[PDB]
Every structure is written in structure tokens, then in C-alpha cells.
Design a protein around this ligand. Sequence first.
Ligand SMILES: Nc1ncnc2c1ncn2[C@@H]1O[C@H](COP(=O)(O)OP(=O)(O)OP(=O)(O)O)[C@@H](O)[C@H]1O
Ligand SMILES: Nc1ncnc2c1ncn2[C@@H]1O[C@H](COP(=O)(O)OP(=O)(O)OP(=O)(O)O)[C@@H](O)[C@H]1O
Ligand SMILES: OC[C@H]1O[C@H](O[C@H]2O[C@H](CO)[C@@H](O)[C@H](O)[C@H]2O)[C@H](O)[C@@H](O)[C@@H]1O
Ligand SMILES: [Mg+2]
Ligand SMILES: [Mg+2]
Lengths: 362, 362, 285, 273, 435
Amino acid sequence: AEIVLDRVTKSYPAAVKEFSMTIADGEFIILVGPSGCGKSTTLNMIAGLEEITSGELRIGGERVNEKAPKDRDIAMVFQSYALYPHMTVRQNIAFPLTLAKVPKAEIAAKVEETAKILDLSELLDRKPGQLSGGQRQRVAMGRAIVRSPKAFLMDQPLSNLDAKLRVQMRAEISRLQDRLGTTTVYVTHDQTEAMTLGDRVVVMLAGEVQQIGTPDELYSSPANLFVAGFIGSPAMNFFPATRTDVGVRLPFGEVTLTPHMLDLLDKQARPENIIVGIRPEHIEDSALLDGYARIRALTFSVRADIVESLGADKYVHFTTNQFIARVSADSRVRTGEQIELAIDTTKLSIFDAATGLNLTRD
Amino acid sequence: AEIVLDRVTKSYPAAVKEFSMTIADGEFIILVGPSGCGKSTTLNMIAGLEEITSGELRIGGERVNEKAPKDRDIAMVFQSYALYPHMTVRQNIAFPLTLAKVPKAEIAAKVEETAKILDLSELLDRKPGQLSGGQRQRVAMGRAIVRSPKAFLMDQPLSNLDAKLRVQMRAEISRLQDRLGTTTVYVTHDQTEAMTLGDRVVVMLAGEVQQIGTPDELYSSPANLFVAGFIGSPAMNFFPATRTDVGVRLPFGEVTLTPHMLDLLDKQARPENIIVGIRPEHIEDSALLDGYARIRALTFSVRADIVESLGADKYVHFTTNQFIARVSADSRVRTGEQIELAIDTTKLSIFDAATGLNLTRD
Amino acid sequence: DDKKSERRLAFWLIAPAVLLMLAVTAYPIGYAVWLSLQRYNLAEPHDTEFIGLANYVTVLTDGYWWTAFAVTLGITVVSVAIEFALGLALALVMHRTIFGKGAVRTAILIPYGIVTVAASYSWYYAWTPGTGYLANLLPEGSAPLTDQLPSLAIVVLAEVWKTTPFMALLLLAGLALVPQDLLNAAQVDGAGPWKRLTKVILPMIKPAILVALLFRTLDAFRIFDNIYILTGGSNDTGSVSILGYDNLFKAFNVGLGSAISVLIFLSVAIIAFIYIKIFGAAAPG
Amino acid sequence: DARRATWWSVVNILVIVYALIPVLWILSLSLKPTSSVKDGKLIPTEITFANYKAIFSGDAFTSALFNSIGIGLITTIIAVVIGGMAAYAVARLQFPGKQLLIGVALLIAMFPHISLVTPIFNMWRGIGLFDTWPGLIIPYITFALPLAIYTLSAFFREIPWDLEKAAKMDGATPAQAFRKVIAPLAAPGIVTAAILVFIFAWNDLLLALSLTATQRAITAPVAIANFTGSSQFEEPTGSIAAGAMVITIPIIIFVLIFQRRIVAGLTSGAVKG
Amino acid sequence: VINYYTPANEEATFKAVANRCNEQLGGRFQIAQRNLPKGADDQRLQLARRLTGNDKSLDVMALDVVWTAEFAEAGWAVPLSEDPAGLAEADATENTLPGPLETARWQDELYAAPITTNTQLLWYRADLMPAPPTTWDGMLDEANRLYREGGPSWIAVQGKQYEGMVVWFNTLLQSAGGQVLSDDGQRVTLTDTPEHRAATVKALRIIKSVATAPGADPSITQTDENTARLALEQGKAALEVNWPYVLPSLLENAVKGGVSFLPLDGDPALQGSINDVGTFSPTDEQFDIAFDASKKVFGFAPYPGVNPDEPARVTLGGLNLAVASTSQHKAEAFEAIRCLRNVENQRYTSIEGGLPAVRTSLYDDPAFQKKYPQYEIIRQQLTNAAVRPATPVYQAVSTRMSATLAPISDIDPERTADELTEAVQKAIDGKGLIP
Ligand SMILES: Nc1ncnc2c1ncn2[C@@H]1O[C@H](COP(=O)(O)OP(=O)(O)OP(=O)(O)O)[C@@H](O)[C@H]1O
Ligand SMILES: Nc1ncnc2c1ncn2[C@@H]1O[C@H](COP(=O)(O)OP(=O)(O)OP(=O)(O)O)[C@@H](O)[C@H]1O
Ligand SMILES: OC[C@H]1O[C@H](O[C@H]2O[C@H](CO)[C@@H](O)[C@H](O)[C@H]2O)[C@H](O)[C@@H](O)[C@@H]1O
Ligand SMILES: [Mg+2]
Ligand SMILES: [Mg+2]
């Protein structure tokens, strides 16, 4: 149901701050936060575990807190794996369902279909301990896929699998939830899974949330200059700047463009110190089209020596420090300062250090 | 030193069946492969654990295949963490230092510098039961980084960490090994971290190795038709073909007419069930001048209706099966009859069935 | 190497244990069987020679031994069976506590250190018509010690109360091993407070009950103290250990006391065999 | 949270009453004069302490309580230490834990002690120290070993295997994995075989009843049985069931010391990925 | 040096006597008492396992009177006629009460010298009974008449399934002729001739109608002698037969409120004392007034017989001394044993001891009657005293003769005679398993 987490907080002899937000039914939500940022603790709390300290949580219109974890019909896939060592995998998958409607003419098909889904149907003999990581993970995930509860709570559910297994699980994990079944709280810091699956993503840091938008409203218009420099693993590099509205600045350069976005920046008294926030995916090599049909694309890149290959398209360690730009595969460069680039000066994230709310979009 | 594995078979029915290769000093060997193909078993058989059945390991001028694992001087990080749940993180990292050489004036600073490296200085005196998952991972890596040992072995040492911290950790690991570390085997699945660290990768499926080439000659020119569908994450080789050396068609039209290497391609002279295997990172929209600053690169005029908008580099699913294609962000696309897809006909690497090598680069 | 480097350690590791266990117990066992091989009386020493299995065939062909056997067995299989079911609850209250910081955790363990004679006289005085804190609670002139069945009831109660801190300690020590994440996932997977037990917490300690279900049903099989000090043989209630005491110490009939000791060594070894075979996972395997 | 604090305060007295009222009746017998020992009345009237000053008459009970408080704290130590070696070698090792050592350590303890006493008596007669601690200690240890073997060989093989692996990797010789790796995790597995051995060798009266002669090593549970109040055929309830309230002091201040190492859930080193 | 062993129940008196014969007597050779446990059968087991080992020690030792000589039938305790031309048989029976000189002979010679004797005798509440019964068939008849009151009809005996049962049954057996085994140690003369059988069935019918008496109730099947000494002290018993300790017991107990319904609050002379565990030695005057106050409600009489005033030949007890055969030197033991039972030793052992001593004419002087005012009767209970059955093995036959009598209730007199006799036979021939 509509899980309304109104001002939740845990403490320790400090782990989450006021988590005021809601999660409607049917839609996803994907937490993401650097490392130890009240993330698995939020799931432990919204489950029956980790009794709250602030004093509010409402699964649906109810007032369900300090209640037994059993009476909240919530499934879970922990960061760790329970994976009861004495049972086999058949029983590990049938456990949460056999404490439910019993008839054995149901489990016999259920623990077979939900094991062919995760590609395990051939491995229904061994017991945990005789299984590798990419199999224990799948079994732990199946133990919550098989439940069909009123809420799926997957906590880093697919961490160590291969690429094609991951791209098939990301398919059959939403091709399953789309029928019905949950307001799921997915947890992952993968930067592709939080963009292809969630209907509403959530970035957080040390408890406090930052942005609760959609997987595109964050890549395009990020607020508070941290989700800005966080999502998009080749993180948006940050050049300094001066106030100078019309032509703002560059580390080596001042001429800029796009007055079509200063109509609202007109009303600003922000400190003159300004971060310009250019994402690397917007840069090209000027030896391709000079940016656009218009030759002028601010040919500025000079010093690049660390050209990491990465196959599909390579990364130049752009230095005017320690910036990164990405150029295409056929780019004829190998540790040579002949890579005068072309940035796109119609889209970029002006910012400042104090409040960093320079989103100024929509 | 020089770890020379020769036909290291293990099974208990199975496991890795035939593993024959060498690892000289200095270079990594980043093992990759799908879940349940045997990587952890390989690292264990290298470290002595899980005694090999019919193999002959070798390290330097001897045959260390039955010696005690204690007598090899080999650090390790497991899939699991194997963290001592009572020793506070301080002693938990200082443990290997408290086994052979114990000058406390040195141990009190080595562990401090190490905890500074891995961003653990704050949560340094705590027991690994009140830590997070990422922090447990970083501590299990810290227990192996501060040893200056005779060799390395790492088994997904950064599985659950944000990309931001992940890239810094990868750069630091590269620096450390650049100082000195021999045979830093590195089992990992994130394709973006198997092409920037490993100076040589080993793709394997069900024990048997596939290729031991550099991570450039692996993505550019794949072998055995599997290391093409496994690396290069959104890979695609679903296209059938029908050879007509001058006129050879495709499910869309004339594509492959490349006499500058077609000589070897015809020298192959193999069954007519060949596969072209066109990457997704080269199918494009109708924006750039086609061919190579030209036209008639077979604009596909595809009719699919599936778009994934992760970031500013979208993926279109096109079937008219289940093909995929990278597309620049500027192409305003939707779920209707839409963009004519143009493919550059210079990077094809045509495959063939019933033998499944068709390397076509030699 | 490792094969040699582990057994060369293990032999010198178990050397003192088995060495001491064979230095002062092999010859006594051999002598206790020798005394069974042939008639022997301490009242007339060296007045006897080899007789064979006469002692065995005469102890198996009486009625005074099957009676002392169908009582010790009928007491063991009802004392340990209730002791386990009560020790589970006692260990749970002893482990899931919030105030049991030595408050209950040791007040549940002092009733095991009380010496057996000073703790059997307590029950013998407790149940006497006229004298005893509870014997007066019964109706006028009850005396539940003169008749058979109430005597068996009180002799099994004085064993339950005595040895409950022996299987309310192993089922706790071997229960503090169960990791928290397992019980946590059992909790979140739709399992109450009982369905958790026998499903996720019990099959883990299955090698921790094999020590509290195999080292009790030996001692509670050779019950001698709480049945001799407490109505030692009235109306055919004597156990088998009292029958091995009477015919050996207070009769000097060694040639038969040794046979009656071996005849319960065998009958308890069959129980140990059945228990080791029924549990699978055990001490050696 | 009074809900889980009233149930847990009633089921915290309905045990400390059940397991205490006999150890209150023994006290009531111990604190009564020799005229009202047999009128019931669990709460004693006219309480006096003649029984304790009676048992403590010069050099009667002190030399039999020292000879036990200083023999238990030796049999426990030497039966856990060398009784843990074979346990660690049968649990975490391959060959020695055969069906021979186990099949012998299973028959040793279970054999009835009654028929076994006289051979040990006539052995210790002319072989060495018959009526002192080493003559009394060795049988205690030899009959307590199987307990301290089956209580450690079942809690020394429930340590997660990856912990042993991580101990091997760092280069820890087996004299250090047993000291800093596998021991503190089995702290609730050692303080449960260092208490049972103590309670077994502290209140048994089948061996020390015949294998002891004089004030030199006459233990308490046997110098507490042969008491004479005033007449031959009588039970000095002022000295039996009233010296137990003194012999139970160490078995209180020992459990109260070793109940700390029984700490709740202690291991977080599991799969976690 | 000679180191005689004595039970721990009466050991301080023997320590003082050992002193008075080792240090007070000339410096010939010292003596000690390295005692042995008080289990009363544990002691026999310990002595047996010591003498079997042939350990050259344990010169002289104290053995109970029931181990007449069957202890020394294989040669454990040396006879007296094998003295080093000493005075063994000339002093151990020069003149000693005709009773305890029977419980030391084996067949035709003595193997020991008795030091302590003990005889049962009725203890009746002199308050409400001026006619102490002298016939068992009238002894329970008195209680039947007395049934009007609720609890004085409790006949208190010692009939628990232990040595008490046989030591109370043998009195009644021999009080009408016949011996359990025989005048020797080969046969079982219990029911052979009708003369013998005319008595066993009446003994069984008197030991049945007292336990199924109109006033007697349960707790009489599991009653040893302690219940028999405490039923009279509580106030719910009128007849009870016990050893001669109960008079000192009552006179030192009923001071502390545990009275037999006589007031005996305690004169402020001894009440003015906080006397330690032992409440003895009030300079004999508080003792005098206490006994005089207990005179009217505490009466005794010679043991109640079954025959027409042929007094019941009681079954005596005590403790004898014997020189062991496990000593390569024994002359010193034979010399010291007769200095351990002499005038002063055997005077002290009862004057300020517990066990009634035995001498030629000790029981007939003002030097003895100051402690045992039942001496005029205890010196006659020791002449026609029916010893416990002479046997080459005792510990076996008794735990079968009492096992047959374990459920006293419903013994059905006329039946169980044959079962008891065949049980004794199976005990005496060596065939069967002891229960
Ligand atoms: N048992 C504990 N005792 C004290 N502090 C704790 C404990 N468990 C967690 N914390 C605190 O909370 C943090 C863990 O929060 P959370 O569960 O969200 O982390 P996580 O999601 O596992 O981390 P990550 O994904 O970065 O690995 C720790 O870094 C610590 O600051
Ligand atoms: N203890 C065991 N007993 C029997 N078979 C086992 C055992 N452990 C592993 N296996 C077999 O090995 C297979 C996995 O091989 P291995 O452990 O080498 O893979 P891995 O490379 O660690 O896996 P992944 O790549 O998914 O992390 C299992 O599917 C199983 O069949
Ligand atoms: O501690 C009292 C309980 O244990 C007793 O165990 C003793 O007797 C056993 C044989 O009968 C011996 O094996 C053991 O060594 C003794 O300690 C007894 O078994 C129980 O009846 C007591 O309740
Ligand atoms: Mg986490
Ligand atoms: Mg693996």
C-alpha cells in the first residue's frame, strides 16, 4: 500500500535523518547513496526490524510500527543471504510459501517455475554451501520472488552476476512486477539499473535525502551539486567560473553562450564564485563536425595524456585539475595532445558552493 | 613469481576441467565469465585450498601443488568477507601484521595509512558486526592490501560500492600494484573494470578458457563467438546472413562489401549459416553523414517501439529478433514508426555456426 | 606437505588424552570382564575356577532383574523425554532474557550443584505424612512413598528437578551459535515464535542435543542415588544399579556383580549406538 | 514497552521459584534446632545456628572443604586443557577422529563405576600415592574426559569454515588459529565444558569414598556423608542437608563468574554476498 | 601402633580410650584409631578389600556383632586359642554376660571379644497406661482399646525394608522356640518340624495385625527406627520399642519445645545456658529434675513377649573387637586388646559414652546406675538374649528374608512361611540373585 515514511529516524550510541516522503502503490523506488548512508538500514526499518526512534511510519492508512515483522506481508532479499544451510535449495525456495497455503499440488509447480525463471531448474538438488555466489544470490532472490507478497523489498538483490544474466534479471524483475504485487523499494548503486527500472528514484546521503525525481530529471536537472556529480559514473567534471552572466568563465577561457537560459538567472544574487558543471558525455572531438553545423563549438581541450581505452569509446584525462572527457572509438589519439575537443555550450549545470540549487529548470 | 598452471582439473560430480596458462611477474590476469563457470575455485586452487584432482601447479623453480597454503605468502579476498567478528577493525586490519613481524611503532602507522587510503579513518575502531556491507568489503580488502606480500588474489574486491568511490578505489589499486605486486588475479564482472585495470583478461565458461588476449584484442577482435556475446555488455549478434561475396545480403539489405579484408573472409569458405555480429555502439540514427562522410550505409528504416533513456545515450530495441542499438541523445525518438538506422560497415567481424570461431583477424 | 603435516600434529595432539584414558582404565575393564569369565567370591578367595557364562545365564533367567530393568528403562524413557521438553523452555528463558544477567542464569544452575545425598534426603523428608512442607498438603494419612506408582512419580520428579540444569545448559550454549540473520529471515518470511522453532533454530543445534541426549540417558539409566536414599527397594522399585550394588558390595559376589555391570554396559551401549545412528551428523562425522 | 516487560517479569519468577523452593527447604532444614526438624512448616520458627558451629568444630570440615576447593580447580583446568586437544584434533582435523578413539571415549564414561572401584583400589595400594590428590585426581580426569570431549568436539566444528580459511591465508601457525581465531568464537563452548567437569568432580562420592583415607585428601562430598550427631543409626540433619548450604557457595561464585562468557550472537562473518 | 579401626559413629570415646591405654599406660607401644566410614556395610566392604590385598597393616579391628565369625570363616580375624600362650580365651570369657559371649563364638571357640552390647526394650507413655502389656497379642490389644483417641493408637515399631525388619522379626521368631537356620551353619530349621512351624505363623500374624491394626495406618510400611523414636516424642504414640538411647535423647530434646506433651519448658538453670551443640553435663542436678519430671509419662518394661510370661529373648547388637590375620606380628595386638576392654576403658565407654558396655558385674554398682536407670532390665535382657541367626554368610540372607517381608501390609500369615523358608534356603545354598 501507500507506505508513507513521515519523519523517520534511527539512532546509535545518527544513522538516518528525517526521511519525510511517501511511496505510492505500484510504482518503484530506488535508493542510492555512496557508502553507509542509511540505506540498508532504511529497508531494515521499513520492515519489522530496527525499531524506529522518531516515531512515525504508516504502511497504508494504518499506523504499523513496533509490530511483528510477520504481520506486514513484506518480502526481502538482504545484502547478505540467509540461505538456511540445513535445507536444500528446493526447501529454501519453498520455505516462505509452505508456511502459507499448504497444498503440495502447488509448490511442485511453483518452486519449478520460479527456478526456471532465475535459470536454476537444473540445480534443485544441492544445498547451500555447495553453491557459488552467483547462485546463492539467485536463490535468496527467489525466496522473495516466490512469495507474491504485498510489498517487495530487495536490498542489493543482484550484486555479483555476469552481464547477460544481469540484463535478463533486470528484464524478468520488472516483467514480473508489472502484473501486480508491490510498491517495491529497490536498492542498488549501479547507475544503469536506477535508470532503466525505477519509476521514481531517490538519492540520499548520511540519512538526509537530496532528490526524489525521475531517472531523467536527475541526469538532466540535478539539484544540490552532489547528485549532480554522483550519478553518471564518469562523474560530471567541475570547472571554476566567475559571475559574468553573459560570458561566464572557463579555467582557460571566458567566452560562453546560451542566453536562452539566463531569463531566470536574471534574478540571482548568488556569490560570484560559480561552478560550471560540464558533463563529459556532452563533449566531442572537434575533428568530427566542429561540434555542430556551426563551426564554433569552443575548441578548448589541449592537455591530455592519460587516454584510457575502455573499448567502445575512450576517456581522455582532461587537464587545463583532474578532469575527464569521453571521445569516440575511432578517435585517432594515443597519448597525444592533438585532441582539441568541442564542448556543447547549450546545456551545462551552472552551480555554486553555498546552496547548489542552481537547477533552474522547469 | 611465475605461476604456471597446467591442466588443473577439479570436479566432484563438475568444476574447472582444463586450465593451462602462465602468469609472469607484474601483469594482472583478470578472470571474468558467467555465474557458475569457475573463478572462485580457480583462485582457491591457486591458493592451495580445495586440493586439485589432476593438475600440476607451479610457482617459480618448483612445483607447489601440495604444499601447505600457509607456506606460499599469498594474500586473498573472498567472495564472502570472512571477517573476524570480535576483533575491532583496527586489529582486524593489523592481523596479518601481527603474525610474522610485530614492531608496534610500525604496525600503528601502517594500518593508519591503510585506513586513510580506503576511506575508513572514521569507522576505524569498531567491530565488524556493527559495520555496513560496503565497509565490511573495504575492511576485507584492507586486511589484504597492507601486507607487501609475494602475490595477490582478489575475488570481486569491490562488489557493493558506489561508482564514485569505486573509481577512486580502482585507481588506487592500480597505483598499489604499480608499486609492486605479482600475479594480481582479479575476478570481476563489471565490464568497465575489466578493461582499465587488467593488462590481460581470461574469459571462461564452464571451466574451459576462451581467450587470454589483451583487453583490446578481445573487444576489437573476439574469438569463439562467445567472448563477443559476453564482453561489450549490450552486445548483439542475432543477425543471420547469406554470403554472396559481391552482393551478400542481410535481414535488411546490402551491408558487407569490404574488400580490404574480404580476402581472408572468402578464404574461410565455410558453411552458409554465417553470422555478421554487428555491435550496438556502431548502429546510429540518421544524423551523421553515413558510410564515412557519405551516404548509402543502409539506413535500416526500422519499425520497433522500445526506447531506454538512461542518461544522454539512449538504447533503442529493434526487431523488424530483440536487437539493440545505441543512439545519441539528440535524436528525439519515441515508441512509434521511427528512425532509419544506419550501420557503419567497417567493424563487422562476421561469425559462422557449427564451429563458432570465425576470428577473421590474423 | 599437508597430509603428513596434519596427522603428525594430530597424533601428538591426542597422545595425552587417550594415553591417560588407557593408563588407568584398560586394566580395570579387563579385570571387570575377567571376574565375569569365572565365579568369584571375596568371602572365600582362590576357592573358584573358570565357569563360563553361568553368571549371565542365571541373571537372565530370574525375575528379580527384569523387574529392576523394566523400572530403570521405564524411568529413563520418561525422565529424559520430559527433561528435554522442559530444558528447551528453560534455555529459551535463560537466553532471550533482559534481566537474566546472573539473576536467573545462575539460579537455574545452583539446583545442579547440590550434592546428591543432601538433595535426596531433602525429598525424602519432604514427602512423609506428618513431616514435610508439602506432604501435609495431601489429604489425611496419604503417605505416597509406601505404594509403587506415587513412589515412581516422586523418584522421577527428584530427577527432573535435579538434572534440568544439565540439559538446560547445553541447549543454551549450543543455541548461542545460531546466527542472527537466519532467525531474522525466518521472522520476516512469515514464521511465528513456534514455527521458527523446529524449522530454523532446532535443526541447527541438532549436534548440540546429541550431547544433552546422550550424556543424560546414560546417568539417568544407572540411577542409584535418588532411588536408594529415597525408598531403596520398597515394593519392587529398585533400579538396575541398586541390583548391581547389592550383589557386589554388600554380598561379596564379585563373579556376579561384574556380570550384572557388563550386562548394563552392553544395554546402554546399544542405546548409544542407536542415538549416534539416528542423528546422522554427530561428533566424528 | 510494558507489554514484553510483564510477561518477562512473571516468567522470570515462575522459574526462580520452581528451581529454588527445594534449595529453600534445604535451608529451612539447616536453620532449625534439633527438636522441630520434623513439623513441616517450610518457614522455620525458632531459628538457630547450632548446626553450622557444629559442623565447624576445629579441624573437621575445613580440611575436607579445602581438599575439594583445591582439587576441583585443578581437575577442571587439566580436563579442559588436555581434554580440548583431542577435541580440536577430532573436529578440525581429518584422520585421528576415527571410529576407534571415539568408540573408546564413548565406552569409557558409560561403564559402571561400581565394579571398577576395587581394581583401582588394589592398584593404587602398592603403585604409588593412594590417599592424596594425584591418586584421586587421575580417576576424576579419566572419567570426566569423555564429557569434555563430546562437549568440545560438537562446538569446535560449528565455527564457519571461511574463518578457518582466512586464518590460514594470513600465515597463522595452528598454535595461533587456536589462540586468536577459533577460541574466542567458541567461548560459549568452553565455559559449558569447564562447568560440567567442575560439577561432576565436585560432588561425586563413588570414588573418593573408598580411595581416600585421612585428612590428606578427604573431599567434602564424602566427609559430609559420614557424620555422627549423637547415635549410630541416625541422620544428623543438622550436619547433612546443612553442609550442602556451605558446599554450594563455590558452585555459586563459579557459575556467577563463568556465565559472562556465554554472550549472545557473536559472529557476523557470513556469506554477505 | 596397633591402629584399631572403629566406626565413625562412636569414635571420640574410642579415641579417648585409645589414649588412656597408650599414653596413660606404660610406654610399651602406642595405639590409634584410623576410623572407617559409617555406612555400616561400607565398613565391611572396606575391610574386605583391605584384607584381601594382604596389606601388612590393620592389626586389630572393630567388627559388628552380626559378623560373628563368618567374617573370619576363611581366616580373616584370627581366633583366640591361637594366642602366643597368652590369656586370650582365659580373659575374653573369664566372666562376661552370657549373651555377648555367644555373638563372638563361631562354632566351638571365640574369634573376637565383645566391647559394646545393646538390647531393645519397650518404651511406653506412662501418662495414660498403668498396665504395660507383656504379650504381643495383648500389646496390640491395648492399642485397639486405646483407638478411642486419634493418634495414641499409633503403634511405633521399626519395620522398614532393611535390617530393622529382620532384627524385629527374629525377636518374635525366637520368642517361641526355633532357630532360622539351625544350631549350626548348614540347614534351615524354620519349618522342618511342626514344633518349629507352630511359632513362625503366629509371629507373622502378630507382625501383620500390628501393621493392619484398627489404629495403625500407612507410613508403617516405610518406617525405620527414627520414626519409631520420633512418634513418641511428637505426642502420637503410646508403645514403641527402641534401643536404650531414647531416654537421653528425650531428656536432652524435650527442653527445646519438641516435647511429648509434658511441659518441660526448661528450668532457668539450664535455660540460663546457651550450651553448644551438645546439651549434656548440667552438673547432674538439672538432669535429676528433668528425669523426675519425665518420670510420670515415660515408662519402660522388659520386652513384650509372645509366650505366657516367657520373656521375649531380645536380639542383641553392639560391637566386638578382633585381631586380624593380616599382621605378621600379633602378640602386641593380643596384649593391647585386653587393655582396650579392661575395667576403666569399659567403664568410661558407657559412663560417658553411648554404647552400653559389658563386664562381669559392672551393671550392679552405684558407679554405673547414675546414667542408665534401665540397668535392672538391661542386665537381664543380656542373659537370655537370642542372637541374630548364626550363619556362614549374613549380608545375603537378611536382604532376602526382609525382601520376602518387604510389603509388610498383607503378609497373610499362614501362606508366606513356605516362601520365606525357600528364600532363606536359596540364600544359604548359594543359588539365585539377591533382590
Ligand atoms: N551495528 C551498528 N552499530 C553502530 N552503527 C551502525 C551499526 N550498523 C550500522 N551502523 C551505522 O550505519 C551505517 C550503515 O548504514 P546502512 O545500513 O544504510 O549501510 P549500507 O547500506 O549497508 O552501506 P553501503 O551500501 O554503503 O555498503 C554504518 O556505516 C554506521 O555508521
Ligand atoms: N561443495 C561443493 N560440492 C559439490 N559441488 C560443488 C561444491 N561447490 C561448488 N560445486 C559445484 O561448482 C559449481 C560452481 O563452480 P565454482 O564454485 O568454481 O564457480 P564460481 O566461479 O565460484 O562461480 P561464479 O562465477 O558464479 O562466482 C556449482 O554449480 C557446483 O556444481
Ligand atoms: O548430579 C546429580 C544427577 O547426576 C547423577 O550422576 C551421578 O551418578 C551417575 C551414575 O548413576 C554417574 O555416572 C555420575 O558420574 C554421577 O555424577 C545421577 O545420575 C542422577 O541421578 C542425578 O540426578
Ligand atoms: Mg547495504
Ligand atoms: Mg565465484
